[PDB]
């Protein structure tokens, strides 16, 4: 119904007192290729919370636009 692998780790911007830590990875979901992905994850990655998923032109856009 729903897969998803983080397929490479790229930053880690906090944690909190429970270990979440809130990332930028590449995941790929339901089998798709990868794209980039700002969302809090578990200590171990096994469960993950709220985020968003942007394409490579999404996640290039931001990145021209505040630098």
């Known amino acids: 119904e729903f897969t998803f692998e983080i397929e490479e780790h ?4 906090s944690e909190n007192e429970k270990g979440w830590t809130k990332e ?5 979901f339901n089998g798709a290729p990868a794209k ?3 969302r809090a994850w ?4 096994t469960k993950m919370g709220k985020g ?3 394409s490579n032109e999404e996640f ?8």
Do not use: E
């Open 52 to 54: 968003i998923t942007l």
């Open 60 to 67: 290039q856009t931001m990145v021209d636009a505040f630098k």
């Open 36 to 38: 980039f992905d700002i």
């Open 42 to 45: 578990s200590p171990d990655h």
């Open 24 to 28: 930028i990875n590449r995941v790929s």
């Open 10 to 13: 790229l930053l880690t911007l």
